[PDB]
Amino acid sequence: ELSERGEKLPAAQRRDMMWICRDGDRAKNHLLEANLRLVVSLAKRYTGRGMAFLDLIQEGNLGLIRAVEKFDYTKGYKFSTYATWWIRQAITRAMADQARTIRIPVHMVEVINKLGRIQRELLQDLGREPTPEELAKEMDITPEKVLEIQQYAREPISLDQTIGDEGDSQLGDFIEDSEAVVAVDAVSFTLLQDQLQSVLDTLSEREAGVVRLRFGLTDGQPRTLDEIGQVYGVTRERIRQIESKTMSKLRHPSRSQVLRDYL
Amino acid sequence: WLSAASFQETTRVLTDAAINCRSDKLNGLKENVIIGKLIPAGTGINRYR
Amino acid sequence: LYRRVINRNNRLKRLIDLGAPEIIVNNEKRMLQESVDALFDNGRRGRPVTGPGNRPLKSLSDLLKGKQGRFRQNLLGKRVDYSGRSVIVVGPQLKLH
Amino acid sequence: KLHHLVDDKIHARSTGPYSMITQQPLGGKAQFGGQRFGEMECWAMQAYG
Amino acid sequence: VRLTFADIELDEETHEVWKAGQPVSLSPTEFTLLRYFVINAGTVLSKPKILDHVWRYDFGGDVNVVESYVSYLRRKIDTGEKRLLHTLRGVGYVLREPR
Amino acid sequence: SRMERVVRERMTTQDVEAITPQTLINIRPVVAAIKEFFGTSQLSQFMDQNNPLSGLTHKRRLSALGPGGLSRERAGLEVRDVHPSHYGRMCPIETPEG
Amino acid sequence: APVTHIWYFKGVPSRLGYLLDLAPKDLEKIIYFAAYVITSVDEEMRHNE
Amino acid sequence: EVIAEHPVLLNRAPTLHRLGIQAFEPMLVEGKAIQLHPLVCEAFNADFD
Amino acid sequence: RGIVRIGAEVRDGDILVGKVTPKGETELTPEERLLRAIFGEKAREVRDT
DNA sequence: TGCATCCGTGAGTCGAGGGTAATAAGGCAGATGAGATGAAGGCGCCGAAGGGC
DNA sequence: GCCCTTCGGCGCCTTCATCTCATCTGCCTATAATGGGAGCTGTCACGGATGCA
Ligand SMILES: [Mg+2]
């Protein structure tokens, strides 16, 4: 308030004010460092899944950092009681959106957690694995969504773990590269292109060009009739007629047998 | 450095070569085998190639 | 490992921008150093960073070391096409060539 | 008769699939395979000239 | 050879539809969309490959055309808010009798 | 041990006389442990059965590798040898050539 | 914040320790936040003061 | 028809010396067993177990 | 039902179960369009894996 | 200056053999891009047929 | 026997708005709750820092 819309700070209103500012700073730091023991104690029950121990400790430290600002002493409860809720919130949020290789929104990691807890609570009471329809009855939602969430929660595996009983090879050695070119269908495609060129050249040149730019062979884009008219000085009905002539002559078994084989 | 790094103590020789800014000639046997060039022996020399 | 590096870096950025006591900042910087450590060479310092199944993770260095490293497994000797394999049987009626 | 019959022991390929990271063909009978041409055979081929 | 599904029925010759036994007149391209739906009954339909196969590959328009056409299919045969022609967010549509 | 840890955690977080053994018990780790043992463990392996003798010899076989054992790289020359105490206990002939 | 490459800090010779005339036992204490170092000193500001 | 004078290499792991890879000329044979000339066994260190 | 009759002989390459998967979408080659235009073949919107 | 003390390197060739797990988390406000709607314009296509050379 | 050139008719085909339906992101919960689970290490040889004394 005194920096913008203020005045030249006097002796007693600048140094003392900055001193109480720093005093509050070190007081906050002091209680924070004193209460990190609570964070590290609470993080013990939270390890064993997703993230490491020290990462959880650090996230709890951030949660306590946030909590100390909103802590109200005037309400007259111990600081630990208020800080525990914020620490738990920070840890849960971090484990939700940070502990997964495939990140999952919290809004539905919540329902994965609830599905797991209800299924494992009902398993011991009923003695058997809970069928997903009964789980859906406990969900008040359609079972199909239950199978969907069940298959969403599945986490990825490692490509480099040894797969055999004896250690000799990794998983990644047994996965085929789908994106690789077949090296057989490529030559087939080239010869098919050659056959198409021969067939089109056998046809009349106007028809060959019309169909070539109709299906976008020589260029990247097939074109509508009006483009064909503008490039050949004819109406679009004439182009429809010449296209009719094209596939009429193309049904000729001389071309039909020689090209149909290529499949 | 390319030949040495592929024989033994890969990290050590790799670090040493990085420090020394060693410029490999890509002229030896194993280097040409690695990079796909003709090996400098037998039918790979310029007299016969 | 890259996810761990990213998480530690982002949390350190948050700590610095927010303003935190120097102990937490030092702890985060140590975690960043150890995370880059694990990324470049897992298990070189301290216990190796472990994932699921309780096995050491494969860092960049482990991908260039030993028999299973790239150098002596994919560069020096490669699986080749146009090849086969079968049991051998004596051919006493064959010619030497 | 032992369980090492030649029918389950003959394998050959012209152009099969390939691995992801490196474009080398895979190995084994379940996959289309491809024999490993290791560095020890590289020694022999280099010695031949 | 007439293709049937629940209460919609199609004759491949004269390009008309019966909805619960009532004949209905419908637009040609809209009819092609319905033909795709019946020819892939029980399989989900996505706007792209719908555009790829049914529509010409030269189509330079926006994406609202297919949504509007589905709206016409709804108002012609499946007038109910819940309808046999279910819609998937980001994955398109599907012809399916609701469970 | 996992059971004891989880029940020790739970017995305090709940008020007295409102706590029952069923809610103290969560049998998940026990079945998880037995499933961990029976599958993806190298000491409980796929039965080698292509004749009655192979089935007979797969059981009643003494192994040395696995959890608590020594790996082949970890194995020295002394262990692979035949001890004089092997007589009558473990056959000195039947052992794989690999 | 900057970090140190392990290949150079940690090894049979600690290359960073060799260049900076220290020991790896006297470097892990610093690049892992256990002990401080004196980056620079003011010589004249101490000689006159 | 196509195997007319087309050389084909034969190898046996482990390939100790240079003669562990030999180029022959193949003749079509029934069955599924590669027929090796009995003389080149010693060079191959090959045996029919 | 889509599977081989019981007591029927098969060999390498013969189909065993007819399982058809929705192919989704891909780049339909223009040459494919001319191919269907010559014979009247349907698009066959599914993949025969 | 020893001198134990450790600390990082090396240790085979092709082939049987595929994947294993916890926990207190819940309303609530806003927003946001996808998809549901309705309305209006720019030809299509004909429904008529003009007509003659 | 059909080209040159018509009004218009709703259709239809887009396209502009313009509304909802999930879907996802940030915020708040007050008795007290205050310092790791577990890890099993040891082949064989061989060059080199190394903490002290
Ligand atoms: Mg032999």
PDB file of C-alpha atoms in Angstrom, chain E residues 44-78:
ATOM      1  CA  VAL E  44     -19.256 -48.188 -34.397  1.00  0.00           C
ATOM      2  CA  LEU E  45     -19.127 -45.512 -37.106  1.00  0.00           C
ATOM      3  CA  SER E  46     -16.604 -42.636 -36.984  1.00  0.00           C
ATOM      4  CA  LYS E  47     -17.046 -39.398 -39.029  1.00  0.00           C
ATOM      5  CA  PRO E  48     -13.642 -39.710 -40.866  1.00  0.00           C
ATOM      6  CA  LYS E  49     -13.915 -43.196 -42.440  1.00  0.00           C
ATOM      7  CA  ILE E  50     -17.587 -42.393 -42.969  1.00  0.00           C
ATOM      8  CA  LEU E  51     -16.317 -39.440 -45.004  1.00  0.00           C
ATOM      9  CA  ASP E  52     -13.684 -41.658 -46.633  1.00  0.00           C
ATOM     10  CA  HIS E  53     -15.977 -44.395 -47.912  1.00  0.00           C
ATOM     11  CA  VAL E  54     -19.485 -42.939 -48.286  1.00  0.00           C
ATOM     12  CA  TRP E  55     -18.431 -39.477 -49.360  1.00  0.00           C
ATOM     13  CA  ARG E  56     -16.112 -38.520 -52.189  1.00  0.00           C
ATOM     14  CA  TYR E  57     -12.473 -37.944 -51.274  1.00  0.00           C
ATOM     15  CA  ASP E  58     -12.735 -34.438 -52.789  1.00  0.00           C
ATOM     16  CA  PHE E  59     -15.017 -33.223 -49.975  1.00  0.00           C
ATOM     17  CA  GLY E  60     -13.675 -29.857 -48.829  1.00  0.00           C
ATOM     18  CA  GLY E  61     -16.478 -28.916 -46.450  1.00  0.00           C
ATOM     19  CA  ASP E  62     -16.624 -28.749 -42.673  1.00  0.00           C
ATOM     20  CA  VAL E  63     -17.532 -31.499 -40.191  1.00  0.00           C
ATOM     21  CA  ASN E  64     -21.014 -30.244 -39.255  1.00  0.00           C
ATOM     22  CA  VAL E  65     -22.493 -31.849 -42.386  1.00  0.00           C
ATOM     23  CA  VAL E  66     -22.280 -35.394 -41.022  1.00  0.00           C
ATOM     24  CA  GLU E  67     -23.669 -34.365 -37.628  1.00  0.00           C
ATOM     25  CA  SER E  68     -26.592 -32.653 -39.345  1.00  0.00           C
ATOM     26  CA  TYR E  69     -27.181 -35.716 -41.519  1.00  0.00           C
ATOM     27  CA  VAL E  70     -27.282 -37.911 -38.408  1.00  0.00           C
ATOM     28  CA  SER E  71     -29.801 -35.422 -37.018  1.00  0.00           C
ATOM     29  CA  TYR E  72     -31.950 -36.000 -40.111  1.00  0.00           C
ATOM     30  CA  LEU E  73     -31.680 -39.774 -39.650  1.00  0.00           C
ATOM     31  CA  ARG E  74     -32.833 -39.250 -36.065  1.00  0.00           C
ATOM     32  CA  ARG E  75     -35.804 -37.056 -36.950  1.00  0.00           C
ATOM     33  CA  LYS E  76     -36.859 -39.402 -39.764  1.00  0.00           C
ATOM     34  CA  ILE E  77     -36.807 -42.824 -38.086  1.00  0.00           C
ATOM     35  CA  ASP E  78     -35.491 -42.626 -34.492  1.00  0.00           C
TER      36      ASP E  78
END
